[PDB]
Design a protein around this ligand. Structure first.
Ligand SMILES: *[C@@H]1O[C@H](CO)[C@@H](O[C@@H]2O[C@H](CO)[C@@H](O[C@@H]3O[C@H](CO[C@H]4O[C@H](CO)[C@@H](O)[C@H](O)[C@@H]4O)[C@@H](O)[C@H](O[C@H]4O[C@H](CO)[C@@H](O)[C@H](O)[C@@H]4O)[C@@H]3O)[C@H](O)[C@H]2NC(C)=O)[C@H](O)[C@H]1NC(C)=O
Ligand SMILES: *[C@@H]1O[C@H](CO)[C@@H](O[C@@H]2O[C@H](CO)[C@@H](O[C@@H]3O[C@H](CO[C@H]4O[C@H](CO)[C@@H](O)[C@H](O)[C@@H]4O)[C@@H](O)[C@H](O[C@H]4O[C@H](CO)[C@@H](O)[C@H](O)[C@@H]4O)[C@@H]3O)[C@H](O)[C@H]2NC(C)=O)[C@H](O)[C@H]1NC(C)=O
Ligand SMILES: *[C@@H]1O[C@H](CO)[C@@H](O[C@@H]2O[C@H](CO)[C@@H](O[C@@H]3O[C@H](CO)[C@@H](O)[C@H](O)[C@@H]3O)[C@H](O)[C@H]2NC(C)=O)[C@H](O)[C@H]1NC(C)=O
Ligand SMILES: *[C@@H]1O[C@H](CO)[C@@H](O[C@@H]2O[C@H](CO)[C@@H](O[C@@H]3O[C@H](CO)[C@@H](O)[C@H](O)[C@@H]3O)[C@H](O)[C@H]2NC(C)=O)[C@H](O)[C@H]1NC(C)=O
Ligand SMILES: *[C@@H]1O[C@H](CO)[C@@H](O[C@@H]2O[C@H](CO)[C@@H](O)[C@H](O)[C@H]2NC(C)=O)[C@H](O)[C@H]1NC(C)=O
Ligand SMILES: *[C@@H]1O[C@H](CO)[C@@H](O[C@@H]2O[C@H](CO)[C@@H](O)[C@H](O)[C@H]2NC(C)=O)[C@H](O)[C@H]1NC(C)=O
Ligand SMILES: *[C@@H]1O[C@H](CO)[C@@H](O[C@@H]2O[C@H](CO)[C@@H](O)[C@H](O)[C@H]2NC(C)=O)[C@H](O)[C@H]1NC(C)=O
Ligand SMILES: *[C@@H]1O[C@H](CO)[C@@H](O[C@@H]2O[C@H](CO)[C@@H](O)[C@H](O)[C@H]2NC(C)=O)[C@H](O)[C@H]1NC(C)=O
Ligand SMILES: *[C@@H]1O[C@H](CO)[C@@H](O[C@@H]2O[C@H](CO)[C@@H](O)[C@H](O)[C@H]2NC(C)=O)[C@H](O)[C@H]1NC(C)=O
Ligand SMILES: *[C@@H]1O[C@H](CO)[C@@H](O[C@@H]2O[C@H](CO)[C@@H](O)[C@H](O)[C@H]2NC(C)=O)[C@H](O)[C@H]1NC(C)=O
Ligand SMILES: *[C@@H]1O[C@H](CO)[C@@H](O[C@@H]2O[C@H](CO)[C@@H](O)[C@H](O)[C@H]2NC(C)=O)[C@H](O)[C@H]1NC(C)=O
Ligand SMILES: *[C@@H]1O[C@H](CO)[C@@H](O[C@@H]2O[C@H](CO)[C@@H](O)[C@H](O)[C@H]2NC(C)=O)[C@H](O)[C@H]1NC(C)=O
Ligand SMILES: *[C@@H]1O[C@H](CO)[C@@H](O[C@@H]2O[C@H](CO)[C@@H](O)[C@H](O)[C@H]2NC(C)=O)[C@H](O)[C@H]1NC(C)=O
Ligand SMILES: *[C@@H]1O[C@H](CO)[C@@H](O[C@@H]2O[C@H](CO)[C@@H](O)[C@H](O)[C@H]2NC(C)=O)[C@H](O)[C@H]1NC(C)=O
Ligand SMILES: *[C@@H]1O[C@H](CO)[C@@H](O[C@@H]2O[C@H](CO)[C@@H](O)[C@H](O)[C@H]2NC(C)=O)[C@H](O)[C@H]1NC(C)=O
Ligand code: NAG
Ligand code: NAG
Ligand code: NAG
Ligand code: NAG
Ligand code: NAG
Ligand code: NAG
Ligand code: NAG
Ligand code: NAG
Ligand code: NAG
Lengths: 445, 127, 127, 127, 445
């Protein structure tokens, strides 16, 4: 006959929700992400490729992306907690033009000094974007953009916003499955699965409409979406060639410190050395539109013989209509109307520097989560900063047309960075190992 | 030899060899800051401890604690699976076998517990 | 059949049947907020783990881990209880028996540990 | 008799008698304030639980859970120690012996695990 | 043949780092150290002396002293967290002379009352040390010493600064080794080792240049240092006779309470009953210089036939140059020039009250950790406060001379409070018990 037996440590797993702990190369300025606070990374992550295994993946229904979003916002609030707040800076500022070149404003306002009975008069430079007047008729009196919503918190200068790679390790009894399929679109069954205890280097860089310093594709351009035909769903694309970009801040600001209270200081720009220079970015037009041609021919496989046309941003909020990123502590906002301005036909071929100049905007008062409050005031970085990033993917949003036309327009898609984390966690899924296996055999012999 | 969770695609007759690598990996800056990462680390450690103890108490009450494979007095029922004696040990892996008996795990656990308790009651406590 | 803790009023000879329901219940929103209920939940889970491990380490060092009932080499002493062999197994419950031997639990534990250690020392370690 | 950790200076042949006092001490105001002492207390308790479970899972997978001393199928290798059979059990203490085999603990653990798993695979699972 | 065996609960240990939990006597006023929150102490600590055991100790490389320092500063910040802060007291004070006797200043300043639209005028006495003028030419206008660095926090009167002893217990699986060697210098191999789960009564009293209420030596004067020849290393000495000291506060202050805001009060000195009397301390000159002679002859064994000369500390920070302590809530700063002023030769012999008058200074605004901020304002204790201490050890600092001379000068050592805990944790070391022992035998018989 047959008797039931129990197997301990059996190799089975089920999809479940669980917490995750950090892992990084802890060693020194601390980093907003508190990478030194978590567990130090292993010298070499043990990665094993499972043979004869086919597993179903779903990058849109994954729980790691939501957990990662909650952990990043929690670490952000944690980092801003011991720092000084901007509660006394809501005074009516007096700004005029600086000595296009009208973006900066030379402000002047009153401020309470360390003495509770005395005050101090200071001056600082603020951008027009983070400046809002009381009324549209007076003129020369302005306020902060986030004053009637919440009080911003000045970031501590002892920490840096460098995107330090963090490894999202799984707890004991749990594992992370990796899909090594060539050109996997992120949804369906994977024919080449691998397992690992901790994920690879995940840089929590913040980007909009473009993916900076992301993971490059394996062999071809991959388009990821749960429903490509659905117009309300976002579209994530990946590139095989890292499109370089050079973003600099030509303005040479002078960091100054003023004491707004006992034991607290406020940092702002004093003056500018030289002259006014508009911040911009550079990109090779040949490689950029060559990759655009590859993306168009890849999209041609899903929309048939229709021609792919790219348009600029629709309009509205500056955070979703412009490509933003944190460059060495300074938040950038570049206009992408020169990168999504072209059309591609079926017989079209892209066929020297010829760089493209992309105008950019700088904002110190940012929210970075689309929340109704809890803003952050980015401190000014002294000197001239320069940033170089590897463009590996972008976000797309198709216009809600009738679809019967020969052409459809695409716009630079936006989001709350959840899709950005999805673009890096698509290859990973969280499972729960059940070491209790049940199987019968002819025992009792 | 394969590493951790490296024999999942193999058949049940061959995947029961490297069980020690999965059994060993069930549990594997001194000051804790109790921050965002600290609280998650503590929760992960407590959850891992609870998971190991929860799956270990079953083996403890079944009379097979500290043993990777053991045989009990509960006979197999054909209602759970109508397959033969060795068609699963030579052609099916553990991934396609756990879903077939997933609806009868609780019943098997209760029968196993009552049979083991009855066996210990009849063996021990002579008078 | 009775549920959890349903045979307390029964005699000791019959209450030792459903011990598996009490042994199984010794350990039985994913993100923790660590609030008033979160801290108490974590403390309760840690206390339950500590209680189970504290009462399990005794069985582990007594040579009876994973066994609900076992017999040792320590003989019973009439000073702890002058009752007969079966008057407690047929007429007294476990509630009126724990208080009679409550003053000698530590002594019995120490004698049990030394006897078990001596037995393991004489059995194992041939040379 | 000596107390907790009282036979460390004695030889290995005589220090293996009071092992129960070290085995028992491996785990030993109700509301927690979660202050400086509260957080450290919780961390110490969790670390103690993790240490005990980490050193207990080895005995669990080696087929010797709940036993203070047991013998396995892995033979001793002269490369680890060239000493005789009883020169360490009659003249050397445990403090001077742990450092000589400290570089081969992982190798012995892996060989022990594979030998125990192979023995359980050959004994159990008849067909 | 031989077979490998596993021993459970084997008696071995290794040096490791681990957390520790408190153990105080459960008993009422809570103590700044929150000793009522930790585990109650055992009725009798089980201490066992290991026979045939010789263990190496290192008091300077120990981790318990660092962990203890972090725990004490953490408890200090914890105790100051629910209390009221001194943020509105940074107003320009107006102080004059009181009605030497010019140490105290009768200040008068404006302060906001419980009503948000009204203020109140109060007066209080402050020491000259915690008073800093705005400029050195105006005169009669002053500020607090810690106003441009951070805002101090008033200590809660519901707790006391009594140095109640605490037992640093080790977690399960860990133990603390004790060295019972007679006259052990704190570095090297100990020939008489003992083990215990929890340390003895450790009073976390904070003192500089002198060890108050410490552990007395066993048989002879012991000098502890990792390198006695190194001039940059601190020197810790222990005494066999408890040198008594009587420190009083003859000023009879009147505690007054003013409400600086809704639901918060500020305590300060109202007036003085009687007359101005300088605070001082008393010590028997015979016993003090007799112990100095013993310390000199003990130091003679390390520096050869050279003569030992004691001089006062070099000018600088008041927390280091003077001896500090506390008498139930009042901080003192006594001048040590009256004690470290003598010379001792090889043939010298010390050979009635004759007490020594040591002038002392009292400061309310203290940092007690040499931090750039996070100060504490000690509330004034009403009535006359007097505390008696047992001088058991001192800290020394040798001058960086050429060493070829016949005499070398010694200065009163001090600095960080790490040495205070190091002078009490030298006898203890933290180890980790590994119950997994490996040893072969002729089994399978
Ligand atoms: C995608 O990834 C790339 C490659 O990592 C990133 O490019 C880096 O950007 C960071 C800023 O985000 C740059 O770091 C900054 O460089 C300046 C000086 O660095 C020089 O010296 C160091 C010496 O260690 C070299 O490693 C480095 O290569 C340079 O030669 C300074 O502006 C910054 O110094 C900061 O710290 C010091 C110390 O406190 C302060 O005094 C400064 O004021 C300042 O705070 C900083 O180190 C880095 O150089 C860039 N690398 C390259 C290769 O160009 C991209 O930013 C990233 N993309 C995105 C969107 O995040
Ligand atoms: C080294 O160790 C010695 C010995 O322990 C310490 O000396 C003690 O110092 C403390 C203060 O730090 C003294 O305690 C204070 O005594 C005063 C009243 O005490 C009387 O009543 C008690 C009742 O039992 C008697 O034991 C005692 O002899 C006296 O008759 C008051 O100043 C204090 O009371 C405080 O608390 C109450 C309650 O809130 C308040 O009402 C008071 O206003 C006040 O705040 C306090 O009790 C103690 O008497 C000293 N002992 C001896 C033997 O002299 C040293 O201080 C210590 N050295 C260092 C540097 O810390
Ligand atoms: C915004 O407006 C402020 C206020 O007018 C400007 O700050 C001041 O700028 C002037 C002109 O550069 C500086 O004056 C110079 O200072 C010294 C000492 O007097 C000397 O080099 C010259 O004689 C000259 O006067 C001045 O230092 C500076 N600050 C203050 C506190 O007076 C600021 O430059 C304006 N910013 C921009 C971007 O236009
Ligand atoms: C610091 O200065 C203040 C303000 O001058 C002093 O407080 C005042 O002290 C005087 C005595 O020196 C008090 O006068 C007496 O008060 C009562 C009621 O009038 C009565 O006993 C006498 O008739 C006499 O007038 C005065 O009231 C008091 N002011 C307040 C508001 O209490 C303080 O004494 C000075 N401190 C020191 C240490 O000198
Ligand atoms: C699964 O995909 C991985 C790559 O993602 C393959 O690994 C490659 O194997 C070839 C042939 O041995 C090597 O030359 C490459 O260096 C490997 N690449 C990497 C990135 O490691 C793997 O072979 C695939 N597995 C199967 C079964 O097809
Ligand atoms: C990603 O690839 C999967 C298959 O690996 C696609 O899923 C199929 O989609 C078609 C659409 O017509 C359905 O008919 C099939 O039933 C789907 N197969 C499975 C197994 O679900 C998915 O559409 C792809 N997505 C993109 C954006 O290319
Ligand atoms: C994916 O989106 C497509 C359209 O983009 C859905 O197909 C039809 O959608 C229209 C509305 O656009 C509905 O009226 C039809 O009922 C849908 N047809 C079917 C057969 O569902 C489609 O449902 C979406 N989902 C999937 C899984 O393909
Ligand atoms: C966006 O594309 C349009 C064409 O679709 C560009 O407009 C042409 O610009 C050139 C100079 O670059 C002019 O000589 C042509 O007359 C323009 N054509 C039309 C129809 O207006 C436009 O410059 C592109 N913009 C960017 C930023 O690349
Ligand atoms: C930004 O301005 C600062 C201030 O003028 C520059 O720093 C000076 O650079 C010169 C270069 O010759 C050095 O000689 C000086 O010692 C620097 N310091 C000062 C205080 O003058 C800085 O170089 C400027 N940055 C750029 C990129 O031009
Ligand atoms: C280790 O030192 C301790 C003291 O630190 C010694 O204990 C003393 O022993 C004598 C002789 O039996 C007793 O009279 C004393 O009362 C003990 N003192 C204490 C403080 O308990 C102990 O004997 C020493 N051990 C060795 C082996 O020399
Ligand atoms: C404490 O005593 C130890 C010995 O027990 C001393 O260590 C010696 O230090 C000297 C320094 O020149 C070395 O040459 C010796 O080799 C050390 N001896 C041993 C056995 O390690 C230590 O210096 C003493 N410290 C004090 C301040 O007296
Ligand atoms: C202890 O300090 C002494 C001096 O106080 C060190 O001995 C010499 O120190 C001088 C500088 O004062 C160096 O130039 C020599 O190289 C040192 N000599 C040696 C042999 O090291 C000594 O090194 C220090 N350390 C110990 C462990 O004794
Ligand atoms: C400090 O001053 C207070 C206030 O005068 C004194 O307290 C009084 O002491 C006398 C002594 O005869 C008592 O009769 C009073 O009842 C006490 N209270 C008041 C409100 O007057 C206190 O004694 C003084 N302390 C010292 C040490 O002289
Ligand atoms: C410090 O020691 C010196 C001597 O080294 C003392 O100075 C002497 O003081 C006495 C009175 O105490 C005078 O009669 C002598 O004339 C002084 N001698 C010299 C050479 O100046 C000094 O008093 C001591 N100070 C303390 C506080 O004890
Ligand atoms: C300083 O230490 C001495 C002992 O070295 C303490 O004197 C003892 O005090 C207690 C108090 O209960 C008395 O019972 C003892 O009889 C005293 N012993 C001796 C030998 O006199 C003294 O109390 C300590 N001083 C302080 C301020 O704590
Ligand atoms: C599983 O993969 C292994 C490794 O290549 C191979 O030997 C075996 O035949 C495969 N089994 C099946 C059923 O495909
Ligand atoms: C970009 O595309 C245009 C239009 O197809 C093509 O003529 C050109 O070669 C491409 N590259 C550059 C650098 O303009
Ligand atoms: C972006 O650039 C285009 C270039 O034609 C310009 O027309 C447009 O106004 C810019 N958008 C913003 C928001 O400045
Ligand atoms: C097998 O399972 C069926 C369905 O639950 C049940 O009716 C039957 O009694 C079981 N047979 C045995 C022998 O346990
Ligand atoms: C029984 O217990 C008594 C009382 O403690 C004790 O004196 C006696 O020795 C014990 N007898 C045996 C056989 O252990
Ligand atoms: C003993 O150890 C040595 C050194 O690691 C190794 O080469 C040898 O194979 C081992 N012998 C046995 C019998 O395991
Ligand atoms: C202190 O030392 C001096 C100088 O050696 C000596 O004469 C005296 O007796 C000692 N004692 C006192 C109380 O002065
Ligand atoms: C300490 O006493 C000495 C004795 O010479 C004296 O010169 C000094 O001014 C006193 N005060 C301080 C604060 O050092
Ligand atoms: C010790 O003798 C020396 C050499 O004569 C002398 O200078 C010194 O004063 C003497 N010390 C005394 C008497 O304390």
């Amino acid at each position: 006959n047959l008797w039931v037996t129990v197997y301990y440590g059996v190799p089975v797993w089920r999809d479940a929700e669980t917490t995750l702990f950090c892992a990084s190369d802890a060693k020194e300025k601390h980093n907003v992400w508190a990478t030194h606070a978590c567990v130090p990374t292993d010298p070499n992550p043990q990665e094993i490729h499972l043979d004869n295994v086919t597993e179903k993946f779903n990058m849109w229904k994954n729980n790691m992306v939501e957990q990662m979003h909650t952990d990043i916002i929690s670490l952000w609030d944690q980092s801003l907690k011991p720092c000084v707040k901007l509660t006394p800076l809501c005074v009516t500022l007096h700004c005029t033009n600086v000595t296009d070149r009208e973006e900066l404003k030379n402000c002047s306002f009153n401020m309470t000094t360390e003495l509770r009975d005395k005050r101090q008069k200071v001056y600082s430079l603020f951008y027009r974007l983070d400046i809002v007047p009381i009324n549209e008729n007076q003129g020369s009196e302005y306020r902060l953009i986030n004053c009637n919503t919440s009080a911003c918190t000045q970031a501590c200068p002892k920490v840096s916003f460098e995107p330090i790679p963090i490894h999202y390790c799984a707890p004991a009894g749990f594992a992370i499955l990796k899909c090594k399929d060539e050109g996997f679109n992120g949804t369906g069954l994977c024919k080449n699965v691998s397992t690992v205890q901790c994920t690879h280097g995940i840089k929590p860089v913040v980007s909009t409409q473009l993916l900076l310093n992301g993971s490059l594709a394996e062999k071809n351009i991959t388009i990821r979406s749960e429903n490509i035909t659905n117009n309300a769903k976002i579209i994530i694309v990946q590139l095989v060639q890292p499109v370089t970009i050079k973003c600099i801040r030509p303005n040479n600001y002078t960091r100054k410190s003023i004491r707004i209270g006992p034991g607290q200081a406020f940092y702002a720009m004093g003056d500018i050395i030289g002259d006014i220079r508009q911040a911009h970015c550079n990109v090779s037009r040949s490689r950029w539109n060559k990759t655009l041609q590859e993306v168009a021919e890849k999209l041609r496989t899903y929309f048939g013989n229709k021609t792919i046309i790219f348009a600029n941003s629709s309009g509205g909020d500056l955070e979703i209509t412009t490509h933003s990123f944190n460059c060495g502590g300074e938040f950038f906002y570049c206009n992408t109307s020169g990168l999504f301005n072209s059309t591609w036909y079926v017989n079209s071929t892209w066929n020297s520097n010829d760089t493209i100049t992309l105008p950019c905007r700088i904002k110190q008062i940012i929210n970075m989560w689309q929340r109704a409050g809890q803003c952050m005031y980015a401190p000014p970085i002294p000197g001239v900063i320069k940033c170089e990033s590897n463009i590996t993917g972008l976000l797309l949003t198709r216009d809600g047309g009738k679809d019967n036309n020969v052409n459809e327009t695409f716009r630079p898609g936006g989001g709350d960075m959840r899709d950005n984390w999805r673009s890096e966690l698509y290859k990973y899924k969280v499972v729960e190992i059940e070491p209790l296996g049940v199987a019968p055999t002819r025992c009792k012999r | 030899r394969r590493g951790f969770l490296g024999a999942a695609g193999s058949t049940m007759g061959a995947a029961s060899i490297t069980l020690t690598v999965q059994a060993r990996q069930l549990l594997s800056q001194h000051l804790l800051k109790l921050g965002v990462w600290g609280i998650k680390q503590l929760q992960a450690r407590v959850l891992a401890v609870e998971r190991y103890l929860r799956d270990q108490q079953l083996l403890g009450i079944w009379g097979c604690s500290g043993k990777l494979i053991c045989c009990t007095n509960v006979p197999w029922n054909s209602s759970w699976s109508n397959k033969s004696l060795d068609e699963i040990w030579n052609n099916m892996t553990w991934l396609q076998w756990d879903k077939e008996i997933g609806n009868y795990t609780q019943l098997i656990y209760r029968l196993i517990e009552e049979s083991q308790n009855q066996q210990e009651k009849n063996e021990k406590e002579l008078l």
